[PDB]
Amino acid sequence: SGAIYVGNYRVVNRHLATHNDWANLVWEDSSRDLLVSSTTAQGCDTIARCDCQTGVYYCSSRRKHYPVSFSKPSLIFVEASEYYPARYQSHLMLAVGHSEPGDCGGILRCQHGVVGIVSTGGNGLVGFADVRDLLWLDEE
Ligand SMILES: Cn1nc(C(N)=O)c2ccccc21
């Protein structure tokens, strides 16, 4: 579980989005597992714009922030989980590290701020959904 609070926008895993998220929707994408909803207050998190392939993510199923090297945002295949079956997901960066399904929402961060959130993985791999290619999050 976890969200990005960038201004009056809550960024969540689409598969973990609440009735309130859909009742106050902005943008969503099934192939990216990303949903942005509206908020009644500006947030405490800033977004990264960069091509960094290193940072740190929160792994809830360890209560640890792990340093990680991670791929650039691109197309990958995922295996069956509690939410989705074995499918492909886009704009998804991968790294070596522990992730279960419940680790989704945990933030990934580089020097430039928030890179994205846990969304995918398996077999000592963790997959992050990129929010760096969503520049509109900073404004409006
Ligand atoms: C981080 N993570 N997200 C999923 C998913 N949404 O299917 C997954 C599945 C297996 C292992 C790790 C995983």
Ligand SMILES: [Zn+2]
């Ligand atoms: Zn950075």
